[PDB]
User: Which sequence fits this backbone?
């Protein structure tokens, strides 16, 4: 199994994937985010944020409260398993995390915390 | 002996759990849905409908258009892995499905298809 995934967020507020499977043989897993299109970060910025499904709402809400300067993410949010920077068009960011941070049979979600974006920019991650 | 879950939908349009883990050893899994509370089926009816995460939106949208008499579910919808009937207060219904219909490292959701309910009445199902 590949221990990485490449994901795009675009100018239509979409990710190009909404499911990630992480094989238990991976020690680490890398998410490579990019932003095709031409809208800048202050209007259409995207991140990739990974938490338990149960933690997503608090992460998203506290991210909105943290504002654009903090990449719409609460600093040192302990619920965040992995995060990229908030990127604008033509940029890219990668995050690597330890697969040991994923428990078996637990539900994970990934999402963008730019306000409003998680309506569409969300997806599910499991172990395999 | 642990191949079932009890779930409730109430008058506030809430399930009492949003995460189900199915033991990979179970041949069959049973969901026992009940409706505590006081509102009838045509106002606050609930079902338990299981699909892949990817299929939830289409099941929900097509169910809305099917109407109350068809339990707000498209007939013979091949995306539905398991469904209870739509129940009103005091009523109960169970569904048993084959665990073979679930795959590892794949994302399932359960939800109610009564119109509007799935924004609140939804949850994630995984294998352990
Ligand atoms: Cu975004
Ligand atoms: Cu979900
Ligand atoms: Cu309902
Ligand atoms: Na591999």
Assistant:
């Amino acid at each position: 199994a590949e221990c990485s995934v490449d994901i795009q967020g675009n100018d239509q507020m979409q990710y190009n994937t909404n499911a990630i499977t992480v094989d238990k043989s991976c020690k680490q897993f890398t998410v490579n985010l990019s932003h095709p299109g031409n809208l800048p970060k202050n209007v259409m910025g995207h991140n990739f944020v990974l938490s338990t499904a149960a933690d997503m709402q608090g992460v998203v809400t506290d991210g909105m409260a943290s504002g654009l300067d903090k990449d719409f993410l609460k600093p040192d949010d302990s619920r965040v398993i992995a995060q990229t920077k908030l990127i604008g068009s033509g940029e890219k960011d990668s995050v690597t995390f330890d697969v040991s941070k994923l428990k078996e049979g637990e539900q994970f979600m990934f999402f963008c915390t730019f306000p409003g974006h998680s309506a569409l920019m969300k997806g599910h991650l499991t172990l395999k």
